[PDB]
């Protein structure tokens, strides 16, 4: 079981715009010194992305910001962060976050990384914590309280043990990371990239592709997600609840993916240097149609345009009289093959919908018309002809 903390403040969420980041290899083929056009899921350039905080400092004019709410998943998610120490261990992916459904999990506990697509039961604010002055020496180890339930489930994993530094410093951020999560068919694909930085604030601008890292056969229903954080000792003696303890110095960003058409640039060693969004500015559109990054003086044609209609009109005669269909079919006399049985049908609104499920017929073949579109369609001079024939002579 976990605890409920209430010591934070209120602060507007605000947005920020993302530069040319979010390119990844879309297949397993090899190319060199060739411009190629691909159609897949991507993140448009110069788009708004939500901006979050987790910072605590000062006691006179300080602020206790602590962001980890629920956010939608949609077709894809773009994730990034900057920090100095080791924060934000992992993520939880689910659909309703209770026992009755199965939700995957990724965890880092300073010794191993645990992946278990499984069933659980999480509380309001699961997290992990660290302690200072352990009284057992070597410092900086603590526990975690995330899930209070479990169940036997399909797939689990555990990684080789490793040793990590858990100090926590102050100053300009010196790290950055990126991740792209997409769910297709019944597989789960992830990508990553690491780069040193020497910036104090805000995401930088640049260009760097990503490489596939792990793919997993899962096939679960995924609709929502949430982020895990960490915290230092409270350096006080409250009831272990109503206290967010101490927040570090880190932030993270969230975007989304949409279908777009791109063209990519390569090199003799491979790799990707830059690209152009065909659907960005009018100028960038002409670059796509000429397969080049440089154009000369002149006039070119790119595409066309149309006016989209905004209303639908249906005009029919306003008569609603029913028709004698049942009396013809449910006759107890019928006729013979010597004389054809002819009966006309006219001036009556029909209803062929019941002649599909409530007909209870054996053979039903329609020639020249779709059987499911009789109601939408209309005709004239419709007749009714029948005769008696042997069972095996229907063909």
């Amino acid at each position, epitope marked *: 079981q976990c605890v409920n903390l209430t010591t934070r403040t209120q602060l507007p969420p605000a947005y920020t715009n993302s530069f040319t980041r979010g390119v990844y290899y879309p297949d397993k083929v090899f190319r060199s010194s060739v411009l190629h056009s691909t159609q897949d899921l991507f993140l448009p350039f110069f788009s708004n992305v939500t901006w979050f905080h987790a910072i605590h400092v000062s006691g006179t004019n300080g602020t206790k910001r602590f962001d980890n709410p629920v956010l939608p998943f949609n077709d894809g998610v773009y994730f990034a962060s900057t920090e100095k120490s080791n924060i934000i261990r992992g993520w939880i992916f689910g659909t309703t976050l209770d026992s009755k459904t199965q939700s995957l999990l990724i965890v880092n506990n300073a010794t191993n990384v645990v992946i278990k697509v499984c069933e659980f039961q999480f509380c309001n604010d699961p997290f992990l914590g660290v302690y200072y002055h352990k009284n057992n020496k070597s410092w900086m180890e603590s526990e975690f309280r995330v899930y209070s339930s479990a169940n036997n489930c399909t797939f689990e994993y555990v*990684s*080789q*043990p490793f040793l990590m530094d858990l100090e926590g410093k102050q100053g300009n951020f010196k790290n950055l990371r990126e991740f792209v999560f997409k769910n297709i068919d019944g597989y789960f694909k992830i990508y990553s990239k690491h780069t040193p930085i020497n910036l104090v604030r805000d995401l930088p601008q640049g260009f760097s592709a990503l490489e596939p890292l792990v793919d997993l056969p899962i096939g679960i229903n995924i609709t929502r997600f949430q982020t895990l954080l960490a915290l230092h000792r409270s350096y006080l003696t409250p009831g272990d609840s109503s206290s967010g303890w101490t927040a570090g110095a880190a932030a993270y960003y969230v975007g989304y993916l949409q279908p777009r058409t791109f063209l990519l640039k390569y090199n003799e060693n491979g790799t990707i240097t830059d690209a152009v969004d065909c659907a960005l500015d009018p100028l960038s559109e002409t670059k796509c149609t000429l397969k080049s990054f440089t154009v000369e003086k002149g006039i070119y044609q790119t595409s066309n345009f149309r006016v989209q209609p905004t209303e639908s009109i249906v005009r029919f005669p306003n008569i609603t009289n029913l028709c004698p269909f049942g009396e013809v079919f449910n006759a107890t006399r019928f006729a013979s093959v010597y004389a054809w049985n002819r009966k006309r049908i006219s001036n009556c609104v029909a209803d062929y919908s019941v002649l599909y499920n409530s007909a209870s017929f054996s053979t039903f073949k329609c020639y020249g018309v779709s059987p499911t579109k009789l109601n939408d369609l209309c005709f004239t001079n419709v007749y009714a002809d029948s005769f008696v024939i042997r069972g095996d002579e229907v063909r």
Partner: T-cell receptor
Amino acid sequence: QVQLQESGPGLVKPSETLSLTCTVSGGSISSSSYYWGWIRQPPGKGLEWIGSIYYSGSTYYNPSLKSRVTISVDTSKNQFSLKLSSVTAADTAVYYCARCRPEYYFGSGSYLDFDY
Amino acid sequence: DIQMTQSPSSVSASVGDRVTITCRASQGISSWLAWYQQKPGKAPKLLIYAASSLQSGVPSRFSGSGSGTDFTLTISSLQPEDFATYYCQQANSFPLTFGGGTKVEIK
């Protein structure tokens, strides 16, 4: 990565100064978040781990012969060193440098295995 | 603490053959192990990592079946260059120690 160049003296009498130092080029030391150490091997015989060091302290020492073993790192240059002023009579060997593999995910170190 | 032992030593063969080495343990160490080869006159490489996994463009054909306590290593062919000493090392506890070492040389 064409790195770990090592230099040291040739002949040292028993109970006198012993100094080793290892210089790395092609990636710097402060920027990385990895671990470093040494490994010793007498002629013939096998090989035995001697220590491990992280930048900004937090050393680690083998239980044996731990007393007079010290690892020091200076960030001004890309170097670190170990000191054994009083020598064990049978320390004649060949001394190596090492680097610890990086953690597959994220950016942590260890895995307790060495490369390069 | 934990001590590892290697049973064979000085196993020889020719160009077309198939050899096998085994490294024993004294504790759990489930599926965490390492291997090395020391080409004479140089410093060792790593090749196999963990249990049954390669590393960094090794010429392959070197596989080690996993186990719980005592593990194994096999090769399927030999070359006029595969001539060195082999070691096994565990990666579970902190006071990490190497094995004895086996010698392989062609004839």
